Every structure is written in structure tokens, then in C-alpha cells.
Write a protein that binds this ligand. Structure first.
Ligand SMILES: CCCCCCCCCCCCCC(=O)SCCNC(=O)CCNC(=O)[C@H](O)C(C)(C)COP(=O)(O)OP(=O)(O)OC[C@H]1O[C@@H](n2cnc3c(N)ncnc32)[C@H](O)[C@@H]1OP(=O)(O)O
Ligand SMILES: [Zn+2]
Length: 417
């Protein structure tokens, strides 16, 4: 019942595969660029106009995080004609940008010298990623006798995740974005890191995986009244069509699993174990320490919500979801849309659809209006029984400086904003 509404001067110089045809022919994982060392990377920041300066924000400082908050609030807009606007609170931004061992230098900003107004931003965070040759390719490579080349890059790699690329609207379409990407590349290279991973809605050279978005209505009445959803014509036959619509997406009001409770700090080592056990099944996936599990998964009000199944003693299952609220433009009754995004999870004692059913119940009980996700992990497996519908977006996954075969999004275990 959803409302469906839908030459590279810089990227052709970058160490990424340049065509879909190239990517579909890659058989081994490995770097694109020729080997470099840190000393081969320019010491000085990339030149920008004299009215501007590079600035590294201190995220512990109120003024700095507020400055980044305001830039993104007013300028981090994928579509000016959308009826919605994503909102990234300072707490959200600290959670996304300041994981344990984050590198301040990788938060790259441009500001105007005279008044110190922040005009552009791009952010990298460390992540440890398994990104060696997909298991099927390695298998096929072994049958041809090339197993050790296929396995050469199997060790998890300490790399960079790039997000929150943003140019102030006054500075748009002036090639500042390539400069931001070059400066981040420079700074990351100077840390002896040579690959990055990143996601985008736009199609760039060249994704290794792409996945459709899916939505699960939690407050159908509100979703229709803001035109996120429509009430289709067959409902225009029934007696109280809106009552019929609310009945169709009705959930139980209390979760089905006993032992389900909010995650607490003492759960961290066990959640790490069952998560890692699950994520290692996928060709591309992160490796998390206890500190990273704690930072990314411990409940964080207004940002991250995480529950465990602990039916006496042992943590056997868990799920998590994070919040991004959308401003609703021009609606008399509603100003905000509260969206729950499926995060990490692991099921070992109950079917996956049963665990995610409880996610929906908990998310609904916490006032969320819609539950969103991309078809990574095993998310595709419960779409139909839990009444998710596909949206119009696609999340495209890219590597920088990494030759990588084309894979399915169900082969990807890295949750990325
Ligand atoms: C080893 C370490 C490596 C580190 C770096 C790894 C790579 C990181 C890569 C970045 C990962 C980002 C992940 C996220 O955060 S995805 C979210 C992106 N941000 C937004 O959508 C916020 C709103 N939009 C904006 O702020 C601007 O429109 C941006 C900044 C996006 C472009 O600014 P502007 O509109 O003023 O344009 P320009 O004249 O300066 O530049 C035009 C050039 O920019 C290319 N472009 C456009 N959109 C994107 C995009 N989303 N990723 C990469 N490149 C993009 C475009 O194809 C063209 O290149 P080419 O077509 O001529 O070749
Ligand atoms: Zn429309």
C-alpha cells in the first residue's frame, strides 16, 4: 500500500573498477592501485581557496559537534523535493562517528576563515572488515589450482568507512566534493590505510553489491495521512477501509519470546560471540571487539535499541534497531516520522522471523511508525511473512582501491548508514 515515487570527470581517475562489466569479471579480491607507502603521500593538505581553511572538529566539544549538526541539518539533503527530511541528532552523530579508537583526523571539514562558518564535511571511521575473495570464487579458484592467490587477502583488514559527505548548498556543483574525497584519501593514506568502504543511493563506479529498501508499516493510519502510504482501491470497497487497513498491519502488543529484555553491559561478551558466529557466515562482514559491540549495540536512548533473549543464564538471541526520524513537510497533523532501521541480530534458539516479529512489536510499543531495512544479511527471508513491502530506494555498496567480484546483498553482513 506504499506510495511509490522515484561521464565521470573525477571518478574515472580513481582506483575503483570503472564499469559494471569490469566488476562482473573480477575473480580475486585485491588492491587496485600500485603499492605505496605513507612517505609517498603529500604532507600538506590539498589546496583550497584562501578564504577557506581545513578544520578538524573536536567531537567532545559542544560547539564543534553543534557546528557539524547544523551543517548536516541544513544541507545533508539527498532530495529537496521529498516530503521528508532525515534528522541526525548530535547523539546519533557521536554514535556514528566516534566509535572506540576513532581517528579525529578522519573527520574532515572546510570552514570559512573570516567567520569560521562550516561549509563542507566528510567523515571516516575505522572498521575491521573481512573482504577477501568470496567463498564461491575461492572454491572455484582452488579447483583451478589458484587457491593461495584466492585466499591471499582473507585476514580481516583495518580500513576506513566513509559517510556524511556534505557540501553546503551555497557551494554546490563547484567540484568541492572531489576535493573532500581527495583530502580524506590523503589523510587516511597517511594513517597507513589504503581501502575504504562506503554506501550511496546514487550509482557510481562501481558497486560490488546493491540492495533494495523494504518497509514495514507500524502506524498505518499515520503513514497514509502523511502520504508515505496509500490506501489502495480495493479498500475503497470495504465498510471502514481505514479500520480494515489498521487490522491488516496489526501486531501483538507484547513480544512472543519469554526472556526477552533490554541488552545490558554485562551481555556484551556473549552478544559479541553469537553475532560474530553469525556474521562470519557472510563473504563481506565486520569484526567487532567487546568495546565495539558495547559502543554500537548498547541501548542509547533516541539512537540505538537492543534486546536480548536470555531464557535463564545464557544470551541465545538478540536484535537491535536504530532510529532516524524524518521531518514531514507541510502536514497539518504530523511533523515527524519515527523510523526504526533494522541493525544487527543473531538467532540461535528461535526462527529468525519470530525474533524480528518481536523487533516489530517492541519498535511499535516504543512509538515507531515504520520499520525500514535493506535486504542484506538474511533480511530478505522474512519480508513476506512479516509484511514488509519494497521501497523505491537502493543502497549501493562500494570499495575504494579494492578489486572485488559482484556479489548479492545477501552476501553482505556490514550494516552501513
Ligand atoms: C583509502 C581511503 C579512501 C577514502 C575515500 C573513499 C571514497 C569516498 C567516496 C564518497 C562516499 C560518500 C558516502 C556518503 O556520504 S553518501 C551521501 C552523500 N551526501 C549527500 O547526499 C548530502 C547532500 N549532497 C551533497 O552534499 C552534495 O551534492 C555532494 C557532496 C554529495 C556532492 O557535491 P556537489 O553536488 O557540490 O558536486 P561537486 O561538483 O562538488 O562534485 C561532483 C562529483 O561528485 C560526485 N559525487 C556526487 N555525489 C557523490 C556521492 N554521494 N559519493 C561520491 N561521489 C559523489 C559526482 O559523481 C561528481 O564526480 P564525477 O561524476 O564528475 O566523477
Ligand atoms: Zn508521488
Amino acid at each position: 500500500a506504499h506510495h511509490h515515487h522515484h561521464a565521470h570527470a573525477f571518478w574515472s581517475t580513481q582506483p575503483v573498477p570503472q564499469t559494471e562489466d569490469e566488476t562482473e569479471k573480477i575473480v580475486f579480491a585485491g588492491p587496485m592501485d600500485e603499492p605505496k607507502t605513507v612517505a609517498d603521500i603529500p604532507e600538506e593538505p590539498y589546496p583550497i581557496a584562501s578564504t577557506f581553511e581545513w578544520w578538524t572538529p573536536n567531537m567532545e566539544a559542544a560547539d564543534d559537534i553543534h557546528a557539524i549538526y547544523e551543517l548536516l541539518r541544513d544541507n545533508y539533503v539527498e532530495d529537496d523535493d521529498s516530503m521528508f527530511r532525515f534528522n541526525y541528532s548530535e547523539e546519533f552523530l557521536q554514535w556514528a562517528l566516534c566509535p572506540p579508537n576513532y581517528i579525529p583526523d578522519w573527520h574532515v571539514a572546510v570552514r570559512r576563515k573570516a567567520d569560521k562558518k562550516l561549509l563542507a564535511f566528510i567523515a571516516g571511521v575505522p572498521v575491521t572488515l573481512r573482504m577477501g575473495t568470496p567463498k564461491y570464487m575461492k572454491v572455484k579458484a582452488q579447483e583451478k589450482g589458484e587457491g593461495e592467490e584466492a585466499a591471499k587477502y582473507d585476514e580481516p583488514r583495518h580500513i576506513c568507512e566513509i559517510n556524511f559527505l556534505c557540501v553546503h548548498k551555497q557551494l554546490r556543483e563547484k567540484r568541492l566534493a572531489p576535493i573532500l574525497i581527495k583530502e580524506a584519501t590523503r589523510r587516511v593514506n597517511r594513517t597507513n590505510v589504503w581501502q575504504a568502504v562506503y554506501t550511496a543511493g546514487v550509482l557510481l563506479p562501481t558497486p560490488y553489491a546493491s540492495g533494495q529498501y523494504f518497509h514495514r508499516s507500524l502506524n498505518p493510519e499515520k503513514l497514509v495521512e502523511i502520504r508515505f502510504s496509500g490506501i489502495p482501491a480495493q479498500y475503497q470497497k470495504f465498510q471502514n477501509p481505514m479500520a480494515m487497513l489498521k487490522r491488516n498491519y496489526q501486531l501483538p502488543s507484547a513480544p512472543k519470546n519469554s526472556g526477552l529484555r533490554e541488552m545490558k553491559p554485562s551481555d556484551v561478551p556473549q552478544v559479541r560471540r553469537i553475532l560474530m558466529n553469525y556474521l562470519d557466515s557472510f563473504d563481506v562482514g565486520p569484526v567487532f571487539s567487546d568495546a565495539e559491540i558495547s559502543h554500537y549495540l548498547l541501548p542509547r536512548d533516541g539512537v540505538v535499541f537492543t534486546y536480548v533473549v536470555e531464557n535463564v543464564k545464557k544470551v541465545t538471541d538478540f536484535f537491535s534497531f536504530y532510529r532516524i526520524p524524518s521531518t514531514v513537510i507541510g502536514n497539518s497533523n504530523y511533523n515527524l516520522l519515527n523510523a526504526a532501521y533494522v541493525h544487527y541480530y543473531a538467532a540461535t534458539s528461535i526462527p529468525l522471523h519470530q525474533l524480528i516479529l518481536d523487533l516489530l512489536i517492541v519498535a511499535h510499543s516504543r512509538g515507531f511508525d515504520v520499520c525500514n531495512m535493506v535486504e542484506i544479511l538474511d533480511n530478505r527471508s522474512f519480508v513476506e511473512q512479516l509484511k514488509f513491502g519494497p521501497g523505491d530506494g537502493h543502497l549501493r555498496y562500494y570499495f575504494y582501491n579494492w578489486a572485488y567480484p559482484k556479489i548479492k546483498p545477501s552476501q553482505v553482513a556490514l550494516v552501513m548508514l
